Amino acid sequence: GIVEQCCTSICSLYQLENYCN
Amino acid sequence: VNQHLCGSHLVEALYLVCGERGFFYTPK
Ligand SMILES: [Cl-]
Ligand SMILES: [Zn+2]
């Protein structure tokens, strides 16, 4: 998930917007 | 790579990025 994707490697604001509601 | 320490940074960044739309945080 986002832990998998954003903790090993740095997610941008762009990538993180994907998890919004 | 501590998901727990990392997780708390992520919930804070999702609060800024998502703002008003909100989000679900399932640690999943
Ligand atoms: Cl930390
Ligand atoms: Zn920290």
Curated annotation (Swiss-Prot), chain A:
Disulphide linkage map: 6-11
Q: What is the lineage of its organism?
A: Eukaryota, Metazoa, Chordata, Craniata, Vertebrata
Q: Which residues of the full protein are shown?
A: 88 to 108 of 108
Question: Which protein are we looking at?
Answer: Insulin A chain
Q: Which organism is it from?
A: Sus scrofa
Curated annotation (Swiss-Prot), chain B:
Name the UniProt record assigns to this protein: Insulin B chain
**What domain of life does the native source organism fall in?**
Eukaryota
